[PDB]
UniProtKB/Swiss-Prot annotation:
Serine/threonine-protein kinase involved in various processes such as cell proliferation, differentiation, migration, transformation and programmed cell death. Extracellular stimuli such as pro-inflammatory cytokines or physical stress stimulate the stress-activated protein kinase/c-Jun N-terminal kinase (SAP/JNK) signaling pathway. In this cascade, two dual specificity kinases MAP2K4/MKK4 and MAP2K7/MKK7 phosphorylate and activate MAPK9/JNK2. MAPK9 isoforms display different binding patterns: alpha-1 and alpha-2 preferentially bind to JUN, whereas beta-1 and beta-2 bind to ATF2. However, there is no correlation between binding and phosphorylation, which is achieved at about the same efficiency by all isoforms. JUNB is not a substrate for JNK2 alpha-2, and JUND binds only weakly to it. It catalyses: L-seryl-[protein] + ATP = O-phospho-L-seryl-[protein] + ADP + H(+); L-threonyl-[protein] + ATP = O-phospho-L-threonyl-[protein] + ADP + H(+). Autophosphorylated in vitro. ATP binds at I32, A33, Q34, G35, I36, V37, K52. It comes from Homo sapiens (Human). PANTHER family: MITOGEN-ACTIVATED PROTEIN KINASE. Its cofactor is Mg(2+). This is Mitogen-activated protein kinase 9. Residues 26-297 form the Protein kinase domain. GO terms for molecular function: ATP binding; JUN kinase activity; protein serine kinase activity; protein serine/threonine kinase activity; protein serine/threonine/tyrosine kinase activity.
Amino acid sequence: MSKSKVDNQFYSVEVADSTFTVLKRYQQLKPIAQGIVCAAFDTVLGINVAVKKLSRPFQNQTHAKRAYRELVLLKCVNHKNIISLLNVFTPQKTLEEFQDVYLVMELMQVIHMELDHERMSYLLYQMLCGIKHLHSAGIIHRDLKPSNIVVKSDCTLKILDFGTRYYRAPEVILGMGYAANVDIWSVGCIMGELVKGCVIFQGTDHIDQWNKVIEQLGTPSAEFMAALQPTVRNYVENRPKYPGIKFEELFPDWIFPSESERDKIKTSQARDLLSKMLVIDPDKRISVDEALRHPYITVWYDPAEAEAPPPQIYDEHAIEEWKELIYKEVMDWE
């Protein structure tokens, strides 16, 4: 029983100050503190990938920290709707000889694209699947925005990062402390932007960002303001009062698809979901679980995507302990 050659045999290519020694599957390598990163083509998967070399990551405590967190964090969070770790390998064949770690990542407009309800609800479904998986691995994104989401021509969506002010939730703006559903506010902002064709809350500065929120959604409840630090409450109380604009005025029927009788029902569904995500008070904001079960979204629901279990929940060593810990993480990828 001969072993797979493209997956087990290495070639070297010189890049800057370092020999890149990679599996034969990774071809046409081109360069693009953490380490050197080459773009490549994975001939097995038939996709573009980024190959990152970490040289002697165990040789420094601070480098070891970075390396060990990145390996365990990226392993926790692999999902079809997240830019994921595809492969980890080392050319070296024993703990004693172990020097280098290679990480392989997937290498990767639609705002202003004319979408129908089918495509919009699918993009939103996929965003929510990606956020749920992150939350289940104990990661809150906190920084969701159009410029860290990619869509393929077939409307397959992936989130690029998981560690501007337009997409940040009120509780973050006012520094109240936050839970998972900060990410729901961001989804609301992106959904609003997709439909309305502009940034929903476009503050000229950090002070104006709050003004844009209350101007459109209205002054928040006594309960929300009671939860603020007294100095923050005092500012928020002294703002002019706003009643809020009805979501039928902010997001009229005619800016959603209106062709069929199905479109009319889906527009009410879309606006209903939007009215439950763009809620100032996070205690009253829809959760990711409830959003995935919302009639607008749940037509796409597949346990394999929505309940895709994370391999583990993400939460001072000697040089030789760090080395051993990193190497065992590489050996899990066979």
